[PDB]
Amino acid sequence: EKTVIKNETGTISISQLNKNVWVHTELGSFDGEAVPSNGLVLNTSKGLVLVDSSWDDKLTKELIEMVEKKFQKRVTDVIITHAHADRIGGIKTLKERGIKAHSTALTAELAKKNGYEEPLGDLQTVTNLKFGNMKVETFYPGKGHTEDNIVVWLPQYNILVGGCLVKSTSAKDLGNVADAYVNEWSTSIENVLKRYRNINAVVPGHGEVGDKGLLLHTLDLLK
Ligand SMILES: [Zn+2]
Ligand SMILES: [Zn+2]
């Protein structure tokens, strides 16, 4: 069984996928309803790297503090996968702590438009990063859940962070489609399936970790 570690109220939890990769999950509170959100923690020889922040600054601060204490190293970098609050809500905390906040230019453009502090806008359609020995690829597959959503691939593990482009099994509909492109979203998923033909685990933006079947599930929800 996978190691799971929580804060006191259970609003932040980390679950181990392998020696150096954990999923972080936080509960936001909205109209009295708990709404969970996932990202990744990468434990690298040169610091911790997160995929996504959290709903707000309070949660982002607590997440950073938890992982820095546990892994005994600093959070150095975060990859922001689109400009909604569950992804980027902690950007003020990142910037003031000197944590590098990577994003596409479009994500940065949308963040600014919406009144958030800006991430770096450094990621291209395909970008390859390396942190210590940890390899990370970012990929913009096209519009879907939002116009700017990217996925993150760990080629040493064939782990895909689908983010909010990819729905969990428990999701029975597409959720928030105000900012979505539902006629393009299938093609974007197909672009991911074509790029990564052998996938070991898929982390959705919300809900339980799964596998390639989550991509197929999302295709079915788009019919
Ligand atoms: Zn979103
Ligand atoms: Zn989301």
Numbering used by the authors: 35 to 257
Reported in the publication:
β-Lactam resistance is most importantly mediated by serine- and zinc-dependent metallo-β-lactamases (SBLs and MBLs, respectively), which catalyze β-lactam hydrolysis. B1 MBLs (e.g., imipenemase [IMP], Verona integron-encoded MBL [VIM], and New Delhi MBL [NDM] types) are the most clinically relevant MBLs; these MBLs catalyze hydrolysis of almost all β-lactams, including the latest generations of cephalosporins and carbapenems. Crystal structures reveal that MBLs have a characteristic αβ/βα sandwich fold, that they possess conserved zinc ion binding sites, and that loops flanking the active site are involved in ligand binding. We report systematic studies on the inhibition of four clinically relevant MBLs (IMP-1, VIM-2, SPM-1, and NDM-1) and the model MBL BcII by the four captopril stereoisomers and both enantiomers of a captopril derivative, 1-(2-mercaptobenzoyl)pyrrolidine-2-carboxylic acid (d- and l-MBP).
For comparison, structures of di-Zn(II)–VIM-2 and di-Zn(II)–BcII without inhibitors were also determined, to 1.20- and 1.30-Å resolutions, respectively. The active sites, which are located at one end of the two β-sheets in a groove surrounded by several loops, were occupied in all cases by two zinc ions, as expected for B1 subclass MBLs. Preliminary structural analysis indicated that partial oxidation of the metal-binding cysteine (Cys221) had occurred in both the crystallized BcII and VIM-2 proteins, in a manner similar to that observed in previous crystallographic studies of these B1 MBLs. Comparison of the MBL-captopril complex structures with the active site of apo-MBLs reveals that several water molecules are displaced upon binding of d- or l-captopril; these displacements likely contribute to the strength of inhibitor binding.
